[PDB]
Amino acid sequence: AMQIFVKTLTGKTITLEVESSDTIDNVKSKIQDKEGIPPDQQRLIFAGKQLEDGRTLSDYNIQKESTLHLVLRLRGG
Amino acid sequence: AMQIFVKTLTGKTITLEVESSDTIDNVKSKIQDKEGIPPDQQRLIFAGKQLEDGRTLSDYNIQKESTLHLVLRLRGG
Amino acid sequence: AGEIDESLYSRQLYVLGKEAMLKMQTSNVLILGLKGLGVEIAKNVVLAGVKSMTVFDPEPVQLADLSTQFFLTEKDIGQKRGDVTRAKLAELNAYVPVNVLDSLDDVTQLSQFQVVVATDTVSLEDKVKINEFCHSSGIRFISSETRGLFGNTFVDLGDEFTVLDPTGEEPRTGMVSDIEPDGTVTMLDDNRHGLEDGNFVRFSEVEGLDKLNDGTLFKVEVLGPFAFRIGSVKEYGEYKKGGIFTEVKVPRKISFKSLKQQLSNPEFVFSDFAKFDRAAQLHLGFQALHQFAVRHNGELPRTMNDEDANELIKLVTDLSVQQPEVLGEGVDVNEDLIKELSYQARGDIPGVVAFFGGLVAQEVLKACSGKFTPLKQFMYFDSLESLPDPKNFPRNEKTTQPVNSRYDNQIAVFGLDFQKKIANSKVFLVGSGAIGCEMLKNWALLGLGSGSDGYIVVTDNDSIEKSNLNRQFLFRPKDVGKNKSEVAAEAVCAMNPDLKGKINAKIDKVGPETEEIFNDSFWESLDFVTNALDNVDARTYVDRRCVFYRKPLLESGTLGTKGNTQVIIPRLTESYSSSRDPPEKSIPLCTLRSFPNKIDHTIAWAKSLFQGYFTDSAENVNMYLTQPNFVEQTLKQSGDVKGVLESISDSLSSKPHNFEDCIKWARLEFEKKFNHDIKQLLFNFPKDAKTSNGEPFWSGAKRAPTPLEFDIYNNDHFHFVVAGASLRAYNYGIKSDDSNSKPNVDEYKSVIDHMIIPEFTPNANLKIQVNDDDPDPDEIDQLVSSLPDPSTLAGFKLEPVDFEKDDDTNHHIEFITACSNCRAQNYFIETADRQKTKFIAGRIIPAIATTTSLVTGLVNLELYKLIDNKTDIEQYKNGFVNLALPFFGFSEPIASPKGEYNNKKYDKIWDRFDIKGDIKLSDLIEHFEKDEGLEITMLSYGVSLLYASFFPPKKLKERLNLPITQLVKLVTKKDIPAHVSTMILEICADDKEGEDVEVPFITIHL
Ligand SMILES: *O=P([O])([O])O[C][C]1O[C](N2[C]=NC3=C2N=[C]N=C3[N])[C]([O])[C]1[O]
């Protein structure tokens, strides 16, 4: 039962509840349930790297209070 | 568990971690994750040979510390 | 001075930059020796523009020197090489004086020069003396030698040399979304930073970390494709938002060693990594060639001579015993290699001379400027795969001996018979621009097409423009306006009169619309085809014809210092089309229309405005006034009905009567586009506006714009009006007041100052799309009624403008530069100058002669392999180069993909079923079963289905007895036109197992 933060391109910080054994999919799905953005469109980075869907927060030593970065894959604008 | 290098036509040097049994396919996807180029558009040459999608690094005797070259066709003249 | 002529140096300037060229224009260059190698180097350096070029070669011209020296004629025999060549070099470029050095007895004269180049006419002893003097005096030294299919070059720029830009690439740049206290910089959404460990960057527009923006450089530690780290930024404050990073290229100091030191301890750059073990062998070999000449009164080994080849081998062997470290402990002398170096020592081969000529010229420009990374310091090269199979063209002292011919030193390598087959070749060259000119020059030197069975066909639809002269060396200022192909062909006939009457210069574009010209009989008669093009569409088209007619294709390309070559061999390799290149980027419409953040976005916007104001508008009026069904057709056939009708309404209600009216219009357009439209945008989205989620609308890559207040003293405001006015006037046949002068600010000011400018009133129902995906973009009726009847406007016509980037007097680039820049001021984007605007809006491709020569050189080493009909894929070489680095890579062509049906192998690119005659359908089906074991299942011609195994008897009875042409007529209702001689049919088929199998296509020969 831990908290992490996700920053978007607009400066917005999203707060999530996760366990260190959750997968990147889970986090993407959790972002959907809270923000409405769908998993297919999320690309999450931590310390410069893109996070692969099958691994866990633990695999990347992502800790409670950690900050990830959320991108939307680019299209329009 | 080895390292190889990919030099591009612009002078950029990319470092990869691969095992000697990886396919050319594998390597090209690592280059996509790093450079953004899609595998169909990548042209890689090593020691006189252009690397083809179905083969392994071992088939081209690529050793640790080897340097591959990512090259382009130019449209002017 | 301190002044660069853009009308001449345009495309080169985009390669080297102003600063590098300014340094070049203060550099005096000396070249020692004017055989082929020296004159290639000199040609390229003179084209590039240096302060002066001086040539030293007192030796008498002999017939054999004409092997690669394209400025010598037989009239010149007897006279000194230096003198005869001077005047011809001088015509290449009126800005570059070319002098002759009468003597070199006093070495002190070398102090006049910044770069000294010693070619193959200078002995190794004199090279070392001269290098010692240059190095100890701070003069840049370069040397080069070619021998048959072998060559080398050596670079020594002294103890202290500074590289100012290592690659010539655009600095990487990007938008920042976050900067953490530890220095971690994360990119704004799916943008990759592209940096590399140890690059440097500066910042601007970073909020919350103010002294990060002062121009300090930070060292880049790459974390991944989407983030890099610059080290703690706690001391600087706390990140809030925004920010752009820009890469900064820093100076780098390097040292070179003298020729003497490098002879015993060379630093190698490889020309072909598949051959790296050869560099050390050849470095010994070239030294041995000099020892041989010392021992034999200055002579090189004789051609194909065994006695001398053994001596050269002994010499090399002696060197490796004395210096075990050169080949390495235990490593043997490659005797076959050394043998051929001896056999070919006297050879003078155009493709090799062209390769080193371009490479060495480029190093001279590096030495003058600090632009690009010098070769450091020895490079060796061979093209031994170019040798023909000795079974077909035996090589020996008899076959290879001189014949008192300009081609003697090519015969020295290949034999008389091979040289004759080169003469009797029939070739098609597509394009007569930069590559085309170099290509024709090499072919003139080879004697290609000069035999009674040979010929050359060259075609280009374009005429000669001024910027062409900088890299298309067959053209002269007096030639501007004439046709490239025609002038080129005359130029090379002057170089080699054996081609008189043998070159057919055509003026046609190659593509689908010219097949009645370049027909079956034309293609089938060729031995091979050579591209010299500047677009992907033409390359694809030729490649497709070559596959169809089964002809080899030699392909090449450049972009600045980068270049490539590709070979395409019938029944052996992939073709050009078999592989994909990365495609052009596309800017989302919403970004162009409402949310620009780069000068590229404002340039495209302004380019469209230009098009609509001065071209589309005019064509629309002329159509409306001459077609009474124009509106009706618009209403139903145009996507943008509103726009087209507004264009006409506006074009006819203003109607200027004098130049003053044109000024008034342009000033009002300024108000519309740079004030009112921006206020309208800020009305729908105030600065502090938010979205459906609580988040600030103006964020990410959207910059909040500010309206402009017209200011005649601001360069961009002023030129927007001057260019707008003059362009309007042209459309309306009105005389410009700046038609015979420059524009007078106070005159414009006077007209504008008495104008009354209508105030902004918002439109509360206007909607602006924020995403592309999103939508959407009774009144149209009123629009149509507002239009005046053509009855009123008898004889009224508008004169549309045709965009022309290379005429500096026409106001076009003036208008787009000013218009882009105003919009840039709206959105706080840095303005760009005319040169940068011309580059982007004109889509100019950067180009230089050095890369063009060198790439054409490689192409011509590959040509030899076509003459020998080589069928071993391993012998051919695709090349990839970047002269900036300098880098050279080669690779074996990819094999054509193969297939199989009923155990019968076939080539999926090259193989087809050829069929003679307008065969009956029934006969075709039976032929395929009996002779191929294939059950035809589907037959089609283009987009129409001619036969299917599932057809009912009624249909089959109508079709089975029809010749193919009649079957096509039956289905398409259109007859075959008479010019058509072949028909391609696609089929599906089953094999003897009842399974569908991929098979070759069918060609019907009528
Ligand atoms: O690269 P450069 O501009 O110096 O030379 C290219 C040359 O090719 C010609 N060209 C382009 N497209 C063509 C063509 N010739 C014939 N057919 C087609 N489709 C161009 O006019 C240049 O002179």
CA pair distance C268, C283, nearest whole angstrom: 10
Positive or negative: CA dihedral C312, C318, C320, C322: negative
- Ligand 1 centroid to Cα of residue C349, in Å, is 27
Residue B15, chain C, CB below 8 Å: the answer is no
Helix, strand or coil, per DSSP, at residue C772: coil
Say if residues C203 and C182 touch (Cβ distance below 8 Å): no
Q: How many residues are there in chain B? A: 77
Place of tokens 């006819």: C652
**C541 within 8 A of C551, measured Cβ to Cβ:** no
Question: Is the Cβ–Cβ distance between C253 and C164 less than 8 Å?
Answer: no
Q: Which residues of C touch B72 (CB under 8 A)?
A: 562, 564, 581-582, 880
Q: What is the spatial distance between Cα C405 and Cα C426, in angstroms, rounded to a whole number?
A: 22
Dist. CA C155–CA C176, nearest whole Å: 42
* Contacts of the segment C801-807: beta carbons below 8 A, 24+ positions apart: C801/C614, C801/C615, C801/C618, C801/C727, C801/C730, C801/C731, C802/C615, C803/C610, C803/C611, C803/C615, C805/C838, C805/C841, C805/C842, C805/C844, C806/C7, C806/C10, C806/C465, C806/C466, C806/C467, C806/C842
For residue C490, give the nearest of C478, C238, C925 by alpha carbon: C478
Q: What is the 3-state secondary structure (H, E, C) of C328-349?
A: CCCCCCCHHHHHHHHHCCCCCC
Q: Which residues of C touch B9 (CB under 8 A)?
A: 562, 880, 882, 887
Compute, in angstroms, the gap from residue C568 CA to the centroid of ligand 1.
Answer: 20
Are C151 and C175 contacting, i.e. CB atoms less than 8 angstroms apart?
no
Pick the CATH number of C170-248 from 3.50.50.60, 3.90.1150.10, 2.40.30.180, 3.40.50.720: 2.40.30.180
Range C283-313 burial, b when 16+ CB lie within 10 A, else e:
bbbbbbbbbbbeeeeeebbbbbbeebbebbb
Cα separations (Å) of C331 from C265, C324, C984?
17, 8, 58
- In DSSP terms, which residues pair with C244 in a beta bridge? C175, C204
A45–C226 C-beta distance less than 8 A: yes
Residues C680, C681, C687, C688: is their CA dihedral positive or negative?
positive
Per-residue DSSP letter, C693: T
Residue type, position C869, single letter:
N
- Mutation test of the interface with chain B: which of C272, C384, C891, choosing the one with the most B Cβ atoms within 10 A? C891
C173 beta partners: C246
HEC string of C81-140 equals HHHHHHHHHHHCCCCCCEEECCCCCCHHHHHHCCEEEECCCCCHHHHHHHHHHHHHHCCE
CA–CA distances in Å: residue C387 to residues C64, C275, C508, C525, C866 = 21, 16, 35, 26, 11
Segment holding C851, helix H or strand E: helix C849-867
Domain span(s) for CATH 3.40.50.12550 in chain C: 118-169+249-420
Answer yes or no: do C536 and B75 touch at CB < 8 A: yes
Burial (CB count <10 Å: 0-12, 13-18, 19+), residue C260: middle
Burial (0-12, 13-18, 19+ Cβ within 10 Å), C580: exposed
Strand, coil or helix: C1001: strand
A73: closest chain C residue by CA? C190
Query: Is C228 in the A-facing interface, judged by CB distances under 8 Å?
Result: yes
CA nearest neighbour of C119 among C145, C141, C99, C140: C145
Under an 8 A CB cutoff, do B47 and C564 touch? no
Q: Residues 6 or more apart from A46 whose CB is under 8 A from it?
A: A60, A62, A66, A68, A69
Residue B77 Cα to ligand 1 midpoint, Å, equals 8
- Burial pattern C38-48, b for ≥16 Cβ within 10 A else e, equals bbbbbbbbbbb
Neighbouring CB atoms inside 10 A of C321's CB total 9
Contact assignment for B12 to C196 by CB distance below 8 Å: yes
Could you tell me the fold of the domain covering C118-169+249-420? Answer: Rossmann fold (3.40.50)
Q: Where in chain C is the domain with CATH 3.50.50.80?
A: 1-117
Distance from CA of B21 to the nearest CA of C (A): 22
Count the Cβ atoms, other than its own, within 10 Å of residue A72: 14
DSSP C226: T
C400 and C456 Cβ atoms separated by less than 8 Å: no
Contact residues for C513 (Cβ-Cβ < 8 A; gap 6+)? none
The DSSP letter of residue C498 is G
Q: Give which of C271, C267, C248, C880 is closest to C561, Cα–Cα.
A: C880
Residue C990 belongs to what H/E stretch? strand C982-990
Taking the CA of residue C766 and the nearest CA in chain A, the distance in Å comes to 19
Among C532, C170, C563, C172, CA closest to C362: C563
- Residue among C962, C947, C956, C953 at smallest CA distance from C1002: C947
Question: What is the torsion angle, in degrees rounded to the nearest 10, for the CA atoms of residue C303, residue C305, residue C310 and residue C313?
Answer: 10
How near does any CA of chain C get to the CA of B50, in Å? 6
Atom of ligand 1 nearest to the CA of B77: 1
Alpha carbon dihedral A16, A19, A21, A22, in 10-degree steps, equals: -30
Q: Which two tokens stand for residue C999?
A: 């098979």
Instruction: Answer whether C183's CB lies under 8 Å from A9's CB.
Output: no
* Residue of B11, B46, B77 lying closest to C434 (CB–CB): B77
Give A 26-45 residues with CB within 8 A of chain C.
43, 45
3-class DSSP assignment, residue C160? coil
Query: Does C278 belong to an annotated binding site?
Result: no
The sign of the CA dihedral C470, C476, C480, C485 is: negative
| Min distance C769 CA to chain A CA atoms (Å) | 9
DSSP per-residue codes, C208-220: T-GGGGSS--EE-
Amino acid at C11: R
Would the CB atoms of C562 and B9 count as touching at under 8 Å? yes
Residues of B with CB below 8 A from C543's CB? Answer: none
A69 interface with C at CB cutoff 8 Å = yes
- The answer to whether residues C748 and C754 touch, using CB atoms and an 8 Å cutoff, is no
What are the catalytic residues of C? Answer: 590
Tally of domains in chain B:
1
Dist CA C14 CA C845 (whole Å): 8
Q: Is C434 annotated as a binding residue?
A: yes
Nearby residues of C592 by Cβ (< 8 Å), 6 or more positions away:
C601, C604, C605, C608
Task: Name the 3-class secondary structure at C229.
Answer: strand
CA dist C246 and C979 (Å) reads 59
Q: Are C85 and C39 in contact (CB under 8 A)?
A: yes
**Inter-chain contacts counted by CB atoms under 8 A, chains B and C:** 105
Distances (CA, A) of C591 to A75, C587, C596, C768: 11, 7, 5, 12
Header resolution in angstroms: 2.4
Give the integer Cα–Cα distance in Å for C518 and C529: 13
Q: Are C42 and C12 within 8 A, CB to CB? A: no
DSSP C615: I
- Asked if the C-beta of A55 comes within 8 angstroms of chain C's C-beta atoms, the answer is no
Q: Quick check: C558 and B45 CB within 8 A?
A: no
Please tell me the residue having the least CA distance from ligand 1 atom 9.
Answer: C431
Integer angstrom CA distances of residue C695 from A10, A11, A13, A47? 7, 8, 11, 25
CATH of the domain at A54: 3.10.20.90
Helix ranges (H only) for chain B are 24-35
Size of chain A in residues: 77
User: Which is it for the CA torsion A29, A30, A31, A37, positive or negative?
Assistant: positive
* β-bridge pairing A67-72 and A2-7: parallel
Give the number of other CB atoms < 10 A from CB of residue C987.
19
Cα separation of C900 and C902, whole Å? 7
Measured at the CA of C892, the angle between CA C888 and CA C898, to 5 degrees, comes to 150
C699 in A contact zone (CB under 8 Å): yes
Question: What whole-number distance in Å separates Cα of residue C433 and Cα of residue C49?
Answer: 20
Residue in C939, C918, C943 with CA at minimum distance from that of residue C1004: C918
On whether C898 is known to bind a ligand per the annotation, the reply is: no
Kindly state the helix (H) or strand (E) to which residue C838 belongs, with its residue range: helix C834-842
The nearest alpha carbon in chain A to C768 belongs to A77
Residue A68's contacts (CB-CB under 8 Å, 6 or more residues apart) are A4, A5, A6, A7, A27, A44, A45, A46, A51, A62
C636 vs C780: CA distance, rounded Å: 12
Measure C185 CA to nearest chain A CA, in Å.
Answer: 8
Helix/strand/coil for A19? coil
Structure tokens, A51: 């996070």
B11 interfacial to chain C (CB closer than 8 Å): yes
PDB experimental method: X-ray
CA C198 to chain centre: 30
With CB atoms and an 8 Å threshold, state whether A69 touches C186.
yes
C222 touches chain A (CB under 8 A): yes
Partner-chain contact B77 C579, CB within 8 Å = no
Q: Do the bridges between strand C184-187 and strand C227-229 make them parallel or antiparallel, or are there none, so unpaired? A: antiparallel
The residues pairing with B3 across neighbouring beta strands, listed in sequence order, are B17
Q: How many CB atoms lie within 10 A of CB B67?
A: 13
Place of tokens 């180009």: C847
Superfamily of domain C912-1006, CATH level 4: Ubiquitin-activating enzyme E1, UFD domain (3.10.290.60)
Q: Do C189 and A76 touch (CB under 8 A)?
A: no
Neighbours of chain A (3+ CB pairs under 8 A): C
Q: Are C829 and C596 in contact (CB under 8 A)?
A: yes
In CATH, the number for domain C580-844 is 1.10.10.2660
User: Which pairing describes strands C982-990 and C996-997: parallel, antiparallel, or unpaired?
Assistant: antiparallel
Chains that touch B (3 or more CB pairs under 8 A): C
d(Cα C534, Cα C99) in Å, to the nearest integer? 35
How far is it, in rounded angstroms, from Cα C375 to Cα C366? 9
| Main-chain dihedrals φ then ψ at residue C229, nearest 5 degrees | -120, 145
Distance of alpha carbon A4 from alpha carbon A62, whole angstroms? 9
Q: What share of chain A is helix, strand, coil (3-state, %, to 5)?
A: 25, 35, 40
For C225-363, strand residue ranges (E) read: 227-229, 244-248, 252-254
Least Cα distance to C492 among C452, C533, C432 occurs for C432
Its domain, for residue A39, covers 1-77
H helices present in C447-518, as ranges: 484-495
H/E element, C599 = helix C599-611
Report how far residue C627's alpha carbon sits from residue C640's, in angstroms, rounded to the nearest whole number: 19
Residues C195, C222: contact at Cβ < 8 Å? yes
Superfamily of domain C421-579+845-911: NAD(P)-binding Rossmann-like Domain (3.40.50.720)
Mutation to probe ligand 1, out of C460, C464, C517 (largest number of atoms < 8 A from CB)? C460
DSSP C467: G
**Count of other CB atoms within 10 angstroms of residue C955:** 12
As a whole number of angstroms, the distance between CA C666 and CA C675 comes to 13
- Cross-strand partners of B16: B4
Structural contact between residues C470 and C846, judged by C-beta atoms closer than 8 angstroms: no
Contacts of C319 (CB under 8 A, 6+ apart): C284, C287, C288, C326
Chain B environment of C194 (Cβ under 8 Å): 12
Measure the CA–CA gap between C873 and C466, rounded to whole angstroms: 42
| B34 to C225: CB separation less than 8 angstroms, yes or no | yes
- Classify residue C906 as exposed, middle or buried by CB count within 10 Å of its CB (0-12, 13-18, 19+): middle
- Assigned token pair, C934: 């294939």
Whose structure tokens read 């590096």? C366
H-run or E-run covering C818:
helix C812-826
Q: How many residues does chain C have?
A: 1006
Taking an 8 Å cut-off on Cβ atoms, the answer to whether C579 and B43 are in contact is: yes
Q: Which of C587, C588, C592, C611 is nearest to C823 (CA)?
A: C592
Check whether C958 is labelled as a binding-site residue.
no
Q: Under CATH, what is the fold of the domain C1-117? A: FAD/NAD(P)-binding domain (3.50.50)
Closest alpha carbon to C950 in C965, C966, C932, C938: C938
Q: Which residues line ligand 1 (CB under 6 A)?
A: B 76-77; C 430-434, 436, 459-462, 484, 509-511, 532-535, 538
What is the rounded distance in angstroms from the CA atom of residue C79 to the CA atom of residue C62?
9
Would an 8 Å CB–CB cutoff place B54 in contact with chain C?
A: no
Q: For residues C817 and C833, what is the distance between their CA atoms, to the nearest angstrom?
A: 7
Query: Contacts of residue A72 in chain C, CB cutoff 8 Å?
Result: 189-190
> DSSP 3-state assignment of C623?
helix
Report the C-alpha gap between C846 and C558 in whole angstroms: 9
Residue among B19, B12, B3 at smallest CA distance from B35: B12
Q: How far apart are CA C107 and CA C124, in angstroms?
A: 16
**Chain B touched by C562 (CB under 8 Å):** yes
Distance CA C180, CA C571 (A): 59
**CB contact at 8 A, C108 and C120:** no
Q: Which residues of A touch C226 (CB under 8 A)?
A: 45, 48-50, 69, 71
Question: Which subunits have 3 or more CB–CB pairs within 8 Å of chain C?
Answer: A, B
Residue C460 known to bind ligand: yes
Question: Which tokens go with C565?
Answer: 């070559």
Q: Extract the tokens encoding C506.
A: 């055509």
Q: What is the DSSP annotation of B18-39? A: E-TT-BHHHHHHHHHHHH---G
Measured between CA atoms, the residue of chain A closest to residue C222 is A48
* DSSP bridge partners of C145: C152
As to burial, measured by CB atoms within 10 angstroms (0-12 exposed, 13-18 middle, 19+ buried), residue B54 is exposed
DSSP state at residue C583 = P
In Å, how far is C697's CA from the nearest CA of chain A? 8
Contact C823, C605 (CB under 8 A): yes
Rounded to 10 deg, the angle between the C715-731 and C745-754 helix axes is 80
Contact (Cβ atoms closer than 8 angstroms) between residue C527 and residue C426: yes
In angstroms, the CA C387 to CA C659 distance is 70
Answer for the pair C532, C432: CB distance below 8 angstroms, yes or no. yes
Instruction: Judge whether C818 and C714 are in contact, CB under 8 Å.
Output: no
Contact C971, C939 (CB under 8 A): no
CA–CA separation, C259 vs C154, rounded Å? 8
Q: Which helix (H) or strand (E) holds C458?
A: strand C455-459
DSSP secondary structure code for residue B42 in this structure: -
